[PDB]
Scaffold this active site. Structure first.
Site, PDB file in Angstrom:
ATOM      1  N   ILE A  85       1.027  -0.970   0.080  1.00 57.60           N
ATOM      2  CA  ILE A  85       0.041  -0.019   0.020  1.00 57.60           C
ATOM      3  C   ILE A  85       1.048   1.318  -0.060  1.00 57.60           C
ATOM      4  CG2 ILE A  85      -1.872   1.152   1.147  1.00 57.60           C
ATOM      5  CD1 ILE A  85      -1.568  -1.832   2.772  1.00 57.60           C
ATOM      6  N   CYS A  86       0.672   2.139  -0.874  1.00 60.28           N
ATOM      7  CA  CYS A  86       1.475   3.569  -0.864  1.00 60.28           C
ATOM      8  C   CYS A  86       0.760   4.426  -0.363  1.00 60.28           C
ATOM      9  CB  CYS A  86       1.690   3.807  -2.424  1.00 60.28           C
ATOM     10  SG  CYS A  86       3.062   4.976  -2.470  1.00 60.28           S
ATOM     11  N   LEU A  87       0.951   4.612   1.073  1.00 61.93           N
ATOM     12  CA  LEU A  87       0.051   5.441   2.142  1.00 61.93           C
ATOM     13  C   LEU A  87       0.871   5.918   3.110  1.00 61.93           C
ATOM     14  CD1 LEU A  87      -2.700   6.582   2.551  1.00 61.93           C
ATOM     15  CD2 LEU A  87      -3.508   4.574   3.541  1.00 61.93           C
TER      16      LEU A  87
END
Ligand SMILES: [Zn+2]
Ligand SMILES: [Zn+2]
Lengths: 153, 126, 474
Positions: A85-87
């Site tokens: 997850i790119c977060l």
């Protein structure tokens, strides 16, 4: 030790009053690990999907963010097939935004929210992000089929 | 015993000040013929709550970091100088957190940083 | 069709590829953009081909090199491509940018100026080339007007044009790496300073840091005159609004600290600051100094070299504050002429009032300063008006600062008290009325304290046979 108290409160708060469409329980197979589930969002290609997650709380938690993977393959601009997850809230600052003010519940909420509204500026799958940007229909179709292939039963 | 004990206040920078100032001006009205409580009432010009317990049975005066009451004897004492947070902490937990941060500078026995919940200036004196 | 350029490059240079340019002719957008969307590892190799394939010895290589550049600037920008590819592709566009003739780079820089006017510079990773091109223009000393003149007018057009409010800081971090003259650095930073006004406060500090590290090879007078004139205006407007505090105190402070860590490595920075904040004639001191200038100085007193210089200025100025005003308040003729600019005790005290939001460095300077004034201007003439009153008044101040300081900063009020006791105790070699008179009003305001400092009063009593009577009494 901040681990023990955080886990005790968050576990039981998530077992009795979780956020809606989200579950998080002490992994039966791994009672140091967590199992998380996101239910397929209404009015999304992820509709009719149960997305399993492995939720590991680092030993320095809550001073460090959880390490969470999708076990369910997902077709997403900002999430690769392997579930990464790119977060920002899963990384320490100045880049990330993690603090003990936030928690497992509010970050699983930020995740379900991103699943609703992908942010193309942090792309893990450049192909999926450009298809999301230019060809919404193809993305929605491939992602909904993805939901019915991977997030079904 | 009736003689003046050693005294101090834990809590909010904005809350604690007027207690200190009131203590300074009144302490001469202290009198060792009375009880400690009967002297406190007239020195600090207040009455005490008697175990305000059941109403706020999960209000979280807890660390807000470890989310627990009672860390190894230690209690949530260090608070935010803010009306909107008032979020208590531990000495232990707030030091351990603020040590990490870029923003945090240490003077001699004090650490300035951001309150975890509201990101306002909070000071910790070890 | 990607494995018909790998073969071409695998053998020999500019023989089949310089022609392979003229064959395809279509557009290096589909061959990169759509090729990137699937697998960018190709693009990192591909560009090695085209560039070796299109050597600048020929103009039909050069205009194929000038277009691939105009493309991959625009695709990395508008494109949500990965960081990892961009860290390579830019790597290439840098690594190859060295060996160009004159009139192509001025046009690439004109694209860059056009982008800073309008273009969505969503990452200024695009402007990572803009440093090295002004280098590579200057190294070619041949008339295209020479390279350095074109560079001068180019950075004048960067300054004259409007800056992307978002990433003005990131643009100013680029003139860090170019070699410049005085005029050039001055132009770029006075525009970066025009930009503080039209920003949020919380990003002014890092911009000030990146100004100072530039000002290390440029104007210091200007950098600190800008920060001072700006915060001087700010605090005056905060004052007449009172007639955004809880954060205005964070900025002033964080800045003083960021300028500290620089004057620490850059001893000339300190000297230019100090020269700027000279009294000299008292008319410069009634336009120069401030409630912010002075927090900054009274942080500066912590630098080992710099403590002393600083204090000496403040102290001597302090006296004139009394002497102007004293000689002024003798006379109506003078009160008619001068419109009374707030005087120097006031300012120092407004620092102390500001101080609350707990910039605890200034405090070492205050306390140091405070006993300097009383130890300096104490009653010893008394065991005139000229050599008396602006020394008593000075003493009063010392006292006044410390008592107010003691009231506010719970941390300090141990070592105000000891530092008093020190001067009280063994002397009456010298008079000490003043210290006891303070000592009164210290303990009068908040004498809980001596419960915390009990060892120290215990070992003032162990001299309470040798002490003279009027002292002991009080
Ligand atoms: Zn705690
Ligand atoms: Zn707070």
């Amino acid at each position: 030790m901040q681990r023990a108290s955080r886990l005790k409160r968050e576990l039981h708060m998530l077992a009795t009053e979780p956020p809606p469409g989200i579950t998080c329980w002490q992994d039966k197979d791994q009672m140091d690990d967590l199992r998380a589930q996101i239910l397929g969002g209404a009015n999304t290609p992820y509709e009719k999907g149960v997305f399993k997650l492995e939720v590991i709380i680092p030993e320095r938690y809550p001073f460090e963010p959880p390490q969470i993977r999708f076990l369910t393959p997902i077709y997403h601009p900002n999430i690769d097939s392997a579930g990464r997850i790119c977060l920002d809230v899963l990384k320490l600052p100045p880049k990330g935004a993690w603090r003990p003010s936030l928690n497992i519940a509010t970050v699983l909420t930020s995740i379900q929210l991103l699943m609703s509204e992908p942010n193309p500026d942090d792309p893990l799958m450049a192909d999926i992000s450009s298809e999301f940007k230019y060809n919404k229909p193809a993305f929605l179709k491939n992602a909904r089929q993805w939901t019915e292939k991977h997030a079904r039963q | 015993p009736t003689m003046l004990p050693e005294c101090f206040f834990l809590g909010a920078d904005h809350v604690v000040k007027p207690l200190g100032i009131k203590l300074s001006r009144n302490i001469h009205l202290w009198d060792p013929e009375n009880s400690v409580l009967q002297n406190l009432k007239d020195v600090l010009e207040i009455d005490f709550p008697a175990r305000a317990i059941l109403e706020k049975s999960d209000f979280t005066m807890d660390c807000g970091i470890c989310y627990a009451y009672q860390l190894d004897g230690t209690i949530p004492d260090q608070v935010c100088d803010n009306s909107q947070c008032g979020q208590p902490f531990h000495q232990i937990c707030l030091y351990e957190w603020l040590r990490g941060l870029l923003t945090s500078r240490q003077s001699f026995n004090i650490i300035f940083g951001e309150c975890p919940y509201c990101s306002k200036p909070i000071t910790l004196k070890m | 069709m990607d494995q018909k350029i790998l073969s071409l490059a695998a053998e020999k240079t500019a023989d089949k590829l310089q022609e392979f340019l003229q064959t395809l002719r279509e557009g290096d957008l589909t061959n990169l953009l759509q090729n990137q969307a699937v697998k960018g590892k190709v693009a990192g190799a591909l560009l090695r081909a085209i560039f070796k394939g299109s050597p600048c010895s020929e103009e039909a290589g050069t205009l194929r090199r000038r277009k691939i550049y105009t493309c991959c600037i625009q695709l990395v920008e508008s494109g949500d491509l990965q960081k990892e590819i961009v860290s390579e592709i830019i790597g290439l566009l840098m690594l190859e940018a060295h060996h160009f003739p004159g009139p192509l780079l001025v046009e690439l820089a004109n694209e860059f100026i056009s982008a800073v006017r309008e273009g969505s510079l969503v990452n200024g990773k695009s402007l990572e080339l803009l440093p090295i091109i002004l280098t590579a223009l200057a190294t070619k000393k041949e008339n295209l007007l020479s390279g350095e003149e074109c560079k001068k007018q180019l950075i004048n057009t960067l300054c004259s044009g409007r800056w992307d409010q978002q990433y003005v800081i990131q643009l100013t971090s680029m003139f860090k790496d170019v070699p410049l003259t005085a005029e050039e650095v001055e132009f770029v930073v006075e525009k970066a300073l025009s930009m503080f006004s039209k920003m949020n406060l919380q990003e002014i500090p890092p911009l000030v840091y990146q100004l100072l590290v530039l000002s290390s090879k440029g104007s210091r007078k200007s950098v600190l005159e800008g920060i001072i004139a700006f915060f001087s205006a700010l605090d005056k407007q905060h004052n007449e609004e009172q007639s955004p505090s809880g954060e205005l105190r964070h900025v002033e402070g964080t800045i003083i600290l960021h300028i500290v860590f620089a004057i620490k490595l850059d001893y000339e920075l300190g000297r230019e600051l100090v020269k700027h904040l000279k009294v000299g004639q008292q008319g410069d001191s009634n336009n120069n100094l401030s409630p912010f200038s002075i927090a900054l100085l009274l942080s500066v007193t912590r630098i080992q070299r710099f403590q002393d210089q600083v204090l000496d200025l403040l102290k001597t100025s302090v006296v004139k504050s009394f002497k102007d005003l004293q000689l002024l308040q003798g006379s109506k003729f003078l009160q008619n002429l001068v419109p009374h600019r707030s005087y120097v005790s006031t300012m120092i005290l407004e620092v102390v009032k500001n101080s609350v939001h707990s910039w605890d460095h200034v405090t070492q300077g205050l306390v140091e300063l405070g006993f300097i004034l009383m130890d300096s201007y104490g009653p010893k003439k008394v065991l005139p008006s000229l050599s008396r009153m602006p020394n008593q008044h000075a003493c009063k101040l010392g006292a006044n600062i410390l008592l107010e300081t003691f009231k506010i900063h719970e941390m300090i009020r141990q070592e105000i008290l000891e530092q008093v006791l020190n001067r009280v105790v063994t002397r009456a070699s010298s008079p000490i009325s003043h210290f006891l008179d303070l000592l009164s009003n210290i303990v009068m305001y908040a004498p809980l304290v001596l419960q915390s400092c009990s060892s120290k009063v215990t070992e003032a009593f162990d001299y309470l046979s040798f002490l003279p009577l009027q002292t002991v009494q009080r």
